[PDB]
Enzyme design. Structure first.
Site, mmCIF file in Angstrom:
data_model
loop_
_atom_site.group_PDB
_atom_site.id
_atom_site.type_symbol
_atom_site.label_atom_id
_atom_site.label_comp_id
_atom_site.label_asym_id
_atom_site.label_seq_id
_atom_site.Cartn_x
_atom_site.Cartn_y
_atom_site.Cartn_z
ATOM 1 N N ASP A 8 0.828 -1.399 -0.123
ATOM 2 C CA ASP A 8 0.129 0.120 0.117
ATOM 3 C C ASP A 8 0.999 1.381 -0.183
ATOM 4 O OD1 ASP A 8 -2.563 1.365 -0.025
ATOM 5 O OD2 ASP A 8 -2.591 1.411 2.087
ATOM 6 N N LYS A 10 2.053 4.652 -0.761
ATOM 7 C CA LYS A 10 1.555 5.846 -1.675
ATOM 8 C C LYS A 10 1.999 7.196 -0.807
ATOM 9 C CE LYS A 10 -2.836 4.654 0.397
ATOM 10 N NZ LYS A 10 -4.321 4.640 0.207
ATOM 11 N N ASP A 52 1.638 2.637 7.861
ATOM 12 C CA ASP A 52 0.326 1.720 7.333
ATOM 13 C C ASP A 52 0.545 0.612 6.624
ATOM 14 O OD1 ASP A 52 -2.224 0.925 6.721
ATOM 15 O OD2 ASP A 52 -2.469 2.610 5.620
ATOM 16 N N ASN A 90 1.104 7.544 2.820
ATOM 17 C CA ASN A 90 1.650 6.566 3.719
ATOM 18 C C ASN A 90 3.256 6.805 4.105
ATOM 19 O OD1 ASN A 90 -0.805 5.421 4.185
ATOM 20 N ND2 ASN A 90 -0.654 3.676 2.900
ATOM 21 N N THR A 130 4.705 -35.741 -6.382
ATOM 22 C CA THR A 130 4.868 -35.535 -7.748
ATOM 23 C C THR A 130 3.402 -35.188 -8.350
ATOM 24 O OG1 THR A 130 4.004 -38.097 -8.522
ATOM 25 C CG2 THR A 130 6.250 -37.726 -7.646
HETATM 26 N N1 YIR Z 1 -4.317 2.025 8.985
HETATM 27 C C1 YIR Z 1 -3.566 0.921 9.503
HETATM 28 N N2 YIR Z 1 -4.161 -0.001 9.546
HETATM 29 N N3 YIR Z 1 -2.665 1.275 10.075
HETATM 30 N N4 YIR Z 1 -2.220 2.433 9.992
HETATM 31 C C2 YIR Z 1 -1.055 3.033 10.581
HETATM 32 C C3 YIR Z 1 -0.188 2.079 11.306
HETATM 33 C C4 YIR Z 1 0.887 2.513 12.254
HETATM 34 C C5 YIR Z 1 0.583 4.309 12.763
HETATM 35 C C6 YIR Z 1 -0.047 5.027 11.602
HETATM 36 C C7 YIR Z 1 0.178 6.459 11.516
HETATM 37 C C8 YIR Z 1 -0.280 7.166 10.479
HETATM 38 N N5 YIR Z 1 -0.151 8.641 10.564
HETATM 39 C C9 YIR Z 1 0.575 9.353 11.587
HETATM 40 O O1 YIR Z 1 1.306 8.736 12.453
HETATM 41 C C10 YIR Z 1 0.218 10.855 11.323
HETATM 42 C C11 YIR Z 1 -0.284 11.416 10.098
HETATM 43 C C12 YIR Z 1 0.091 13.102 10.580
HETATM 44 C C13 YIR Z 1 -0.220 14.225 9.888
HETATM 45 C C14 YIR Z 1 0.010 15.228 10.527
HETATM 46 C C15 YIR Z 1 1.023 15.584 11.434
HETATM 47 C C16 YIR Z 1 1.392 14.187 12.039
HETATM 48 N N6 YIR Z 1 2.178 14.201 13.164
HETATM 49 O O2 YIR Z 1 2.712 15.528 13.639
HETATM 50 O O3 YIR Z 1 2.523 12.852 13.846
HETATM 51 C C17 YIR Z 1 0.947 12.824 11.683
HETATM 52 N N7 YIR Z 1 1.194 11.639 11.898
HETATM 53 C C18 YIR Z 1 -1.014 6.711 9.618
HETATM 54 C C19 YIR Z 1 -1.469 5.485 9.679
HETATM 55 C C20 YIR Z 1 -0.966 4.550 10.525
#
Ligand code: YIR
Ligand code: YIR
Lengths: 286, 286
Positions: free
Chosen positions: A124, A126, A145, A129, A164
């Protein structure tokens, strides 16, 4: 509803930093240290096993889990990535300078290489992420993610091939030609990410064309706009082209991409190592 | 080593009835009833989940689990199938009369149809995994050994196709054409089983040929020996040919096979229903 008691016990919850389809990311303060953390909320394949994968991985360009609470919803505590998502840097036709693209992409490659060496495929990748450590242009990035990730291991195919095939269907035998290249899907995604970073627009899209998105992708015919690319180097585009190869067996692996002339850049590599050292905080050494 | 205490508590163990690579099948007597049972030993994907699958399935041509003990080894208690394996009836060029082939094959089809309707693929159908209820030629058969079986459900592909493929690799899109036909591997195996039952020899084998087994299978070119087949009907062979179709999407399904002219046989079907009724033992009805 409220935050779970066990979470409230250790953390003070604060403002919203971001939103996914799954749920928000919140600012929090760890009570013990008074330091800022991020808390990812995922509302109720599964999250606990994703968290287990991420607990075992140890790479500076892969997000680390500080804590986890499995309650009404899932709460995942991690270090703050104050730069936010890579998405926000490339949206609305914005684009990064080639140098910043190279620094970020080098780190994505190192991260994904580490994953593939460790039998994990992300599946995934992108810009949403990829997280940025700071609001400075030169910063560490971390992949996040792992909800679509998959662990490689002994396949049903391998067990079948311990012979086999007296009763075995021909399509299983035919699948042998292409088995074991599932990791190449990450390399394709990286190619699309790199394309977007360098150019500010997506290689495959339904914008002003009659060619279906599916036909664009399967034929490998990306949308090439000369004027947008004139500013970007031939070496950068060359790497893009070796990652957006339709045949997964011919596609560049992360190792091939890391050895590409575009990434043979001692300045970029110096900057990355500098950034790693800044991040500590180490103990005394003998 | 000895039998586990919990097994010994309920059963008296007796002579060996058979052997697999995994382990033996033993005769036992259930203490409560003094009646004979079979105990399959498997020495230490996994068995407990196989047993869980088999506990949920309810079809007279699929083996039922009476008890299960997870100790030094696995012990699986089931009803006695005194006829033994189908394997022993077809080995050394022995062959069954066409009528007996039809009765057995009808039951295999009903069993596998039930599996596919219930989201299960067996993936290891062969004569060693077909058991016979009695030493009488006209008997019920039951499919066993679900150690390679797989449960169908929402695929990673289905989750991916909830759009949009901006970052998605072309090989994933190409796989859409052929996805969801994994069950067809059971129909191929049934075709090989039927071929063997009618003829006394295997369709694909390395015996007196320079064509590799793999090339024989992928090309679909089975070994046709006219003299052996002259005795067998054209309708029987016709069904064989519609099951040994190389394209899995064109291959006959269990439904198509059941509607084939060869299986439109009211005598055979009468015999099967008679055999079902003999097996009881029912309670009084209003
Ligand atoms: N979906 C899922 N199954 N697992 N997802 C996950 C699994 C692991 C943790 C995780 C963390 C994030 N994203 C952040 O931490 C994050 C976005 C962000 C935006 C602005 C500022 C801050 N920041 O100032 O920190 C930010 N931290 C997105 C997806 C997932
Ligand atoms: N491998 C695996 N993962 N699961 N296997 C399985 C799972 C379910 C139980 C099971 C049973 C059998 N076989 C018999 O019961 C059996 C063979 C036989 C031969 C002669 C006489 C009798 N008899 O007079 O009963 C016989 N009963 C073979 C494989 C498996």
């Amino acid at each position: 509803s409220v935050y779970p008691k066990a979470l409230r016990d250790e953390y003070i919850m604060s403002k919203t930093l971001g939103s996914g389809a799954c749920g928000e990311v919140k600012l929090a303060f760890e009570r013990k240290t008074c330091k800022k953390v991020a808390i990812k909320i995922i509302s109720k394949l599964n999250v606990e096993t994703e968290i287990e994968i991420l607990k075992k991985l140890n790479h500076p360009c892969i997000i680390k889990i500080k804590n986890f609470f499995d309650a009404e919803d899932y709460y995942i505590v991690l270090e703050l990535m104050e730069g936010g998502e890579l998405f926000d840097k490339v949206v609305g036709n914005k684009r990064l300078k080639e140098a910043t693209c190279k620094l970020y992409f080098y780190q994505m490659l190192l991260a994904v290489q580490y994953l593939h060496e460790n039998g994990i495929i992300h599946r995934d990748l992108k810009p949403e992420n990829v997280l940025l450590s700071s609001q400075e242009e030169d910063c560490l990035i971390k992949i996040t993610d792992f909800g679509h990730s998959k662990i490689l291991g002994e396949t049903s195919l391998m067990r079948t091939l311990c012979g086999t095939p007296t009763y075995l269907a021909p399509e299983v035998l035919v699948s042998v030609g292409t088995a074991g290249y599932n990791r190449a899907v990450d390399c394709w995604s990286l190619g699309v990410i790199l394309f977007i970073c360098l150019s500010g627009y997506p290689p495959f899209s339904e914008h002003r064309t009659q060619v279906s998105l599916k036909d664009q992708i399967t034929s490998g015919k990306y949308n090439f706009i000369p004027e947008v690319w004139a500013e970007v180097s031939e070496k950068a585009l060359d790497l893009v082209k070796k990652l957006l190869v339709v045949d997964p067996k011919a596609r560049f692996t992360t190792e091939e991409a890391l050895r590409h002339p575009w990434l043979q850049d001692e300045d970029m590599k110096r900057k990355f190592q500098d950034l790693l050292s800044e991040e500590n905080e180490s103990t005394a050494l003998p």
